[PDB]
Amino acid sequence: AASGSALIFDEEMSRYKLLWTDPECEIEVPERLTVSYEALRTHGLAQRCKAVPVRQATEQEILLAHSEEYLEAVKQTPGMNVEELMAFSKKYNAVYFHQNIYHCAKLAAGATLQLVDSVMKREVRNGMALVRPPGHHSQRSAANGFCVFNNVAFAALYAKKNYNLNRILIVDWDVHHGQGIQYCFEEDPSVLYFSWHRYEHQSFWPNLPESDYSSVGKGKGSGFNINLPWNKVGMTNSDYLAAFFHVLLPVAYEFDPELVIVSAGFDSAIGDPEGEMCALPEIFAHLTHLLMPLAAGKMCVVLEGGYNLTSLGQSVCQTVHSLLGDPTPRISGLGTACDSALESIQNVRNVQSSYWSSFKHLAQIVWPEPLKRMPASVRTVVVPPPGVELTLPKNCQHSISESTAKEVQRIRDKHFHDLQNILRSLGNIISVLDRMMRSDEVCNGCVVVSDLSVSVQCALQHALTEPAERVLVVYVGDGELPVKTNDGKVFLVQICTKETEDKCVNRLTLCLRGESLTAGFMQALLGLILPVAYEFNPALVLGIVEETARLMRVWGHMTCLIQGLARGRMLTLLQGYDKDLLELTVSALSGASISPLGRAPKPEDVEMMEKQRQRLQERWGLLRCTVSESW
Numbered sequence: 351a352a353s354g355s356a357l358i359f360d361e362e363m364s365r366y367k368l369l370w371t372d373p374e375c376e377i378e379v380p381e382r383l384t385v386s387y388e389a390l391r392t393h394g395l396a397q398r399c400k401a402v403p404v405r406q407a408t409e410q411e412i413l414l415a416h417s418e419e420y421l422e423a424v425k426q427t428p429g430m431n432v433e434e435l436m437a438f439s440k441k442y443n444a445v446y447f448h449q450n451i452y453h454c455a456k457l458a459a460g461a462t463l464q465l466v467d468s469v470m471k472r473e474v475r476n477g478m479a480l481v482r483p484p485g486h487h488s489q490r491s492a493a494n495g496f497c498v499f500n501n502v503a504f505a506a507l508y509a510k511k512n513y514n515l516n517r518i519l520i521v522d523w524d525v526h527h528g529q530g531i532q533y534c535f536e537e538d539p540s541v542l543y544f545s546w547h548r549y550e551h552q553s554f555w556p557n558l559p560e561s562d563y564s565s566v567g568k569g570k571g572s573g574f575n576i577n578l579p580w581n582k583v584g585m586t587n588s589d590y591l592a593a594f595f596h597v598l599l600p601v602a603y604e605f606d607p608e609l610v611i612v613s614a615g616f617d618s619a620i621g622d623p624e625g626e627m628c629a630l631p632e633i634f635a636h637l638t639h640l641l642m643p644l645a646a647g648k649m650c651v652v653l654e655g656g657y658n659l660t661s662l663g664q665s666v667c668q669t670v671h672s673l674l675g676d677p678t679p680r681i682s683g684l685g686t687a688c689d690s691a692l693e694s695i696q697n698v699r700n701v702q703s704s705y706w707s708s709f710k711h712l713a714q715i716v717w718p719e720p721l722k723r724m725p726a727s728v729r730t731v732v733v734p735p736p737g738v739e740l741t742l743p744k745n746c747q748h749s750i751s752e753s754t755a756k757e758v759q760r761i762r763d764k765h766f767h768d769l770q771n772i773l774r775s776l777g778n779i780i781s782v783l784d785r786m787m788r789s790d791e792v793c794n795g796c797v798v799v800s801d802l803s804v805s806v807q808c809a810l811q812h813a814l815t816e817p818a819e820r821v822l823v824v825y826v827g828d829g830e831l832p833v834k835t836n837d838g839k840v841f842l843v844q845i846c847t848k849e850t851e852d853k854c855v856n857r858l859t860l861c862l863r864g865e866s867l868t869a870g871f872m873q874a875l876l877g878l879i880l881p882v883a884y885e886f887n888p889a890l891v892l893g894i895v896e897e898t899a900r901l902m903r904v905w906g907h908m909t910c911l912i913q914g915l916a917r918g919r920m921l922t923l924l925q926g927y928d929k930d931l932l933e934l935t936v937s938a939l940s941g942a943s944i945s946p947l948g949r950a951p952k953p954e955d956v957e958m959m960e961k962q963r964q965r966l967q968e969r970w971g972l973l974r975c976t977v978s979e980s981w
């Protein structure tokens with residue numbers, strides 16, 4: 351029922367700055383804040399967001415995560431002169447203090463709680479807080495690495511206290527390790543902390559052994575801390591996506607968080623002087639998009655680092671875009687994660703195995719600019735059986751031109767000599783694909799259909815000439831859809847009930863063994879289907895479901911995540927009217943929140959799945975989550 355996206359920001363937080371020479375802190379400037387809001391303003395995004403005001407955090411809230419004696423000593427800094435401010439800062443590592451910083455720290459904190467409250471009160475669906483100073487390095491009795499108070503720690507503690515939450519997921523995709531967040535929730539199994547970070551075998555700041563993958567939490571919270579150390583600079587989109595598909599997402603969907611909070615720092619992005627990675631801003635559209643099916647979309651993005659005043663704004667804009675539901679940009683050039691990343695991913699997956707199901711089976715600069723993401727006027731066209739009419743969210747619509755109608759005549763004579771109300775299915779399929787591929791008006795659609803074969807063929811062939819350079823086809827059924835995969839412009843994902851050994855590397859054919867069937871599907875969706883689809887980079891996704899064929903629990907999740915491919919251009923062909931299935935498909939297509947899920951897959955199922963990884967990862971390297979054996 352919740353709508354919109356909150357943007358919490360206030361120019362006051364840029365009214366503190368470093369007052370002495372120190373090359374460690376020079377990079378953390380007020381302009382980081384004004385650049386990112388200005389970038390949100392320029393692209394129409396901030397205007398499209400519910401502005402929620404900033405508040406100060408109360409002392410009672412600050413004591414949730416900080417010690418009175420630390421709070422007392424910081425409380426004294428607004429009265430310090432500059433010589434005194436330098437001395438107080440030297441008691442800490444990589445942090446400076448300013449007469450206004452205690453003020454803005456309470457604002458950065460309070461802005462986060464505001465965001466937590468807005469999201470949790472259903473007043474918005476998600477949101478983002480542009481704040482200074484950052485939080486994730488801050489610890490219970492010290493400032494650290496530009497942080498005074500742990501803004502994201504507050505949010506989770508505060509949502510625990512005030513909304514009685516049991517399961518919070520913090521995703522820290524900053525390039526630095528959020529050690530303050532690890533410390534704070536180390537023994538807490540209700541807060542699941544994932545952080546990737548530049549490590550370089552402990553030689554990169556903050557130089558902590560606890561920053562390594564060996565740290566999994568302590569006491570009753572072991573398994574709820576997940577460190578992914580990058581041991582080389584220059585990580586790429588393919589590395590980041592591998593991290594999500596083979597570590598974070600599999601754990602995150604199993605955890606089923608009741609709320610997701612992001613330490614969104616963008617020093618993890620190409621051009622950042624500190625992070626020195628190579629991921630494009632566009633990756634952050636997908637980072638965000640891949641987590642939105644969690645917690646019914648209740649996601650609180652919070653700003654940490656990011657220091658290239660140009661790499662910064664672009665990644666902010668990509669995050670808010672996806673928060674607002676705008677189409678994700680296609681990521682091209684994806685492939686294998688580099689070997690150092692495969693090493694880290696391999697190790698972290700292995701030490702975590704004793705605690706998670708998806709892994710349990712292994713224990714036996716100058717860049718280009720990010721285009722523009724025009725939101726679609728009518729996001730989702732719907733085409734129910736003739737006569738039947740349904741209730742559609744405001745961004746949906748129903749059904750034919752003469753030009754369209756002759757082409758059906760054309761196709762009839764050439765390919766289907768024996769021809770009713772199917773030449774309506776065919777007629778709409780064309781106009782929806784025409785509306786999708788031609789105009790950026792309709793974005794995706796769904797069409798209920800009678801004959802499978804005539805309709806899928808006409809759909810796929812009309813798409814290949816649209817032009818769609820490549821079509822990803824995902825079919826839930828047991829037949830053999832007339833989809834030739836010789837040319838390599840078509841990849842096919844078949845989810846059937848009968849084992850059917852695939853021969854070649856442009857089909858992926860899974861046969862699951864019934865209670866198991868949901869948790870089996872999700873591991874395969876995150877482990878196999880999403881990595882291949884993302885490497886393939888289709889221009890259009892073709893969804894198909896057979897009348898005959900427990901895939902009412904997962905279709906929403908798959909319909910949501912598969913829209914990260916193909917600018918969100920999916921066309922779903924449902925055989926047979928099913929009020930709940932159509933309503934669910936249209937809901938996911940149109941952008942609604944996906945309701946959460948909740949039994950670990952059968953061992954025969956994990957076994958079949960990595961048969962398919964083995965058979966396919968030489969071609970589709972984003973499938974890999976171990977270092978390659980070298981002959």
Ligand SMILES: O=C(NO)c1ccc(Cn2cc(CCO)c3ccccc32)cc1
Nearest residue numbers: 373374377444495524526555615654655
């Ligand atoms: O963004 C952050 N955390 O989220 C963050 C960023 C940097 C620092 C401390 N530091 C400062 C520099 C100056 C070079 O330009 C430097 C260089 C190498 C390693 C460490 C370095 C703390 C936190």
Ligand SMILES: [K+]
Nearest residue numbers: 522524526546
């Ligand atoms: K991080």
Ligand SMILES: [K+]
Nearest residue numbers: 535538541574
């Ligand atoms: K924890």
Ligand SMILES: [Zn+2]
Nearest residue numbers: 524526617655
């Ligand atoms: Zn950082």
